Each structure stands twice: as structure tokens, then as C-alpha cells.
Amino acid sequence: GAMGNVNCGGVPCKFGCCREDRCREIDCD
């Protein structure tokens, strides 16, 4: 039932790596 998503304080990002207040979906484990 739960979306299972995530959010970053710097930016809204359902899934990915959040760095420097920026979510990047690439070149990240």
C-alpha cells in the first residue's frame, strides 16, 4: 500500500542519490 518512495531535503526525488542538494540518477550505486 505504501508508496515506498523517498525525498531529499535539498530536492524532491522519489529515487536516486541526493548530493549537494541535488538528486542524480546515474553514476551512483
CA neighbor of 17 nearest in space, from 9, 5, 29: 29
The Cα–Cα gap between 5 and 27 comes to: 20
Sign, Cα dihedral of 20, 12, 15, 26: negative
Q: How many folded domains does the chain comprise?
A: 1
The full DSSP string for 1-29 is --------SSS--SSSEEETTEEE-SS--
Owning domain of residue 3: 1-29
